[PDB]
């Protein structure tokens, strides 16, 4: 069922990144013939890191946003449009309201909303 999930990684920054890679890599290969959309990921996730992480370069869309509020609206929109099987956000803080908003948007697009928190 399309919904909201949240993944948190704590530890050394390098460890958090290497633990993230397999999930993003896996997601980029999803059977659902749609995009893996990443929204306003941290500066650490450069296009080079993403390519080195072995993600499927033909099935990923990376969008930017000026701030959390913008990333939140952009995330719901990408989910809403239903062109991505998964929309990955890097929002923190994230309120129960924002989570509901993301969840609703995900249902409308028959997609998955995944928020990631590093630290």
């Amino acid at each position: 069922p399309a919904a909201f999930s949240e993944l948190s990684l704590s530890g050394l920054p390098g460890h958090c990144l290497t633990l993230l890679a397999p999930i993003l890599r896996e997601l980029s290969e999803e059977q659902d013939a749609r995009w893996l959309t990443l929204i306003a990921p941290p500066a650490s996730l450069t296009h080079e890191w993403l390519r080195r992480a072995g993600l499927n370069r033909e099935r990923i869309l990376l969008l930017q946003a000026k701030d959390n509020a913008a990333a939140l609206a952009l995330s719901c929109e990408a989910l809403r449009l239903g062109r991505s099987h998964t929309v990955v956000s890097w929002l923190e803080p994230l309120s129960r309201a924002a989570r509901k908003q993301l969840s609703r948007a995900a249902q409308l697009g028959q997609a998955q909303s995944l928020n990631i928190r590093l630290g």
Partner: protein, 307 residues
């Protein structure tokens, strides 16, 4: 990260660049280089370079390309200073005058010496401008072609046709400005605003470097079959009329759409293009997502290494 600089040379080049600065065309530094000091005052570009203060004394080249060349030769040093640090340079000018056709090749030489990827996007005069300018333009395009990695020569004549009755002196040159901006933006957005991670600067260089003559076509569509419509439109764009895609060594494709771009649409574009390109041609399809764009899907195709 890649430093991209755009230099408009001469009157027409200055207008083209000023248009670029007031429209989209993000992620690039704009510079107007001219011998006419008066034309360098009321413009939008933040950087200006008055060519040959000693030769023209700031009065322009008087439409004599030799004067344009001598002015550029005088400031070969200031030109290198302006280009310093660039990873890519777009040189745009209206061929046919004195400053642009005379100075552009010299600026290109300096860029070439510094090892900077150089792409020139210039126009050939409208026939209503006369045989003199057209002749001057032809000679200049030959000189320019010897010092740039890729050279897009836009024949204004085609634009006058594309305008039909809306064609006016002002509208015609505005159309040229707009087409020039489309060339720069189409290529630079792939470098500065890629939405995907499959095409990097190195890829663009492969398509652009030491390629030679090039040309581009643009198309746009909305609705259910926009992917095919926009791509076909870009290929049948009169600017690519007498151009055999199968003969092009390189093909750079810019897809620009909003968040509604589907994975299927991105695939259709590449399908249609691989259909026209040769198996030996280097094809790069970049994707630029405009966060607040909707329904419309733009496709720009730049064929490099023509012939």
């Amino acid at each position: 990260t890649a430093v991209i600089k755009v230099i408009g040379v001469g009157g027409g080049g200055g207008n083209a660049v000023n248009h670029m600065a007031k429209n989209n065309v993000e992620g690039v530094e704009f510079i107007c280089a001219n011998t006419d000091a008066q034309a360098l005052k009321n413009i939008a570009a933040r950087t200006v370079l008055q060519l040959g203060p000693g030769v023209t004394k700031g009065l322009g080249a008087g439409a004599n390309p030799e004067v344009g060349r001598q002015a550029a030769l005088e400031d070969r040093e200031r030109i290198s200073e302006v280009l310093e640090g660039a990873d890519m340079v777009f040189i745009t000018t209206g061929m046919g005058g004195g400053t642009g056709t005379g100075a552009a090749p010299i600026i290109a030489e300096v860029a070439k010496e510094m090892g900077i990827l150089t792409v020139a996007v210039v126009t050939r005069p409208f026939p209503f401008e006369g045989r003199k300018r057209m002749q001057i333009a032809d000679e200049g395009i030959r000189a320019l072609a010897e010092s740039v990695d890729s050279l897009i020569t836009i024949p204004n004549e085609k634009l006058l046709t594309i305008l039909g009755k809306d064609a006016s002196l002002l509208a015609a040159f505005a159309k040229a400005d707009d087409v020039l901006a489309g060339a720069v933006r189409g290529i630079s957005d792939i470098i500065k605003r890629p939405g995907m991670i499959n095409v990097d600067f190195a890829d663009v260089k492969t398509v652009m470097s030491e390629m030679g003559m090039a040309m581009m076509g643009t198309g746009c569509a909305s609705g259910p079959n926009r992917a095919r419509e926009a791509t076909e439109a870009a290929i049948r764009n009169p600017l690519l009329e007498d151009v055999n895609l199968q003969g092009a060594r390189g093909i750079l494709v810019n897809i620009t759409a909003g968040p509604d771009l589907s994975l299927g649409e991105y695939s259709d574009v590449g399908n249609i293009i691989e259909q026209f390109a040769s198996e030996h041609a280097t094809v790069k399809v970049g994707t630029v997502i405009d966060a607040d764009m909707r329904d419309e899907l733009h496709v720009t195709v730049v064929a490099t290494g023509l012939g």
